[PDB]
């Protein structure tokens, strides 16, 4: 009923933060501190929407995308990261992100931005 | 045809951008200053305006809160470098459909766009 998010972020402070303010009303998140908890906590048919950076201790948020695409083509993810540069940002487009969202950002921007893709993920009535 | 009102004083960008979009299928009317965008925005007529925040004869936001006021459901993004923290949150609180950043390559815009066009206007 309640979207479930994979929340891949590393930073505690921010990461708690975000789990927090999503859980509040609307999401419920499983929240991975590194890419191979992310492994674990990801399995088809698990998520609504995956959120995640792109440098982990342990990885790339890139090829951690790479990977849920081949195993799922239409999770939707997107990106919420410190390099947003126009690369970046292409190569999260070309890839399929749903999103890219700079840091650093106000929270109610990336609720807005993260309704929006929400509700892309709605059937057609 | 959807119609984009563009609203970009560089003219080397702007020349670019009308291009490709019409050889899209888009009707593109291009403005370079606030003065004409004003002058060019009706209601009823546009499907997405294009604008920046930086303009010669002042700041998009006033543009962006005119149209708003006019027309509060007319999709509209921003394509600019004061593409910072405060200024994206304005953008969104306001409604922007989406906020790109400049630099930008090409196709980053079009894939972009393509999506913000793509959505349902009004409520069927």
Same mark, same amino acid.
């Given at each position: @009923? /309640?979207? #479930?998010?994979?929340?891949?972020? !590393?930073? %505690?402070?921010?990461?708690?933060?975000?789990?927090? &303010?999503? %859980?509040? !009303?609307?999401? &419920?998140?499983?929240?991975?501190?590194?890419?191979?908890?992310?492994?674990?906590?990801?399995?088809?048919?698990?998520?609504?929407?995956?959120?995640?950076? =792109? #440098? =982990?201790? !342990?990885?790339?948020?890139? !090829?951690?995308? *790479? @990977?849920?695409? /081949?195993? *799922?083509?239409?999770?939707?993810? =997107?990106?919420?990261?410190?390099?947003?540069?126009?690369?970046? #940002? =292409?190569?999260?487009? %070309?890839?399929?992100?749903?999103?890219?969202?700079? /840091?650093?950002? +106000?929270?109610? %921007?990336?609720?807005? &931005?993260?309704? #929006?893709?929400?509700?892309?993920? &709605?059937? +057609?009535?």
């Amino acid at each position: @009923m /309640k979207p #479930r998010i994979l929340l891949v972020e !590393d930073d %505690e402070g921010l990461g708690e933060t975000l789990k927090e &303010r999503l %859980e509040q !009303d609307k999401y &419920r998140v499983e929240w991975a501190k590194t890419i191979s908890e992310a492994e674990n906590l990801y399995r088809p048919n698990a998520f609504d929407l995956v959120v995640l950076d =792109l #440098r =982990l201790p !342990d990885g790339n948020g890139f !090829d951690l995308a *790479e @990977m849920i695409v /081949k195993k *799922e083509k239409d999770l939707p993810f =997107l990106f919420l990261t410190a390099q947003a540069g126009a690369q970046e #940002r =292409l190569r999260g487009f %070309e890839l399929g992100a749903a999103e890219f969202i700079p /840091k650093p950002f +106000h929270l109610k %921007e990336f609720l807005i &931005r993260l309704e #929006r893709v929400i509700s892309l993920t &709605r059937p +057609h009535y």
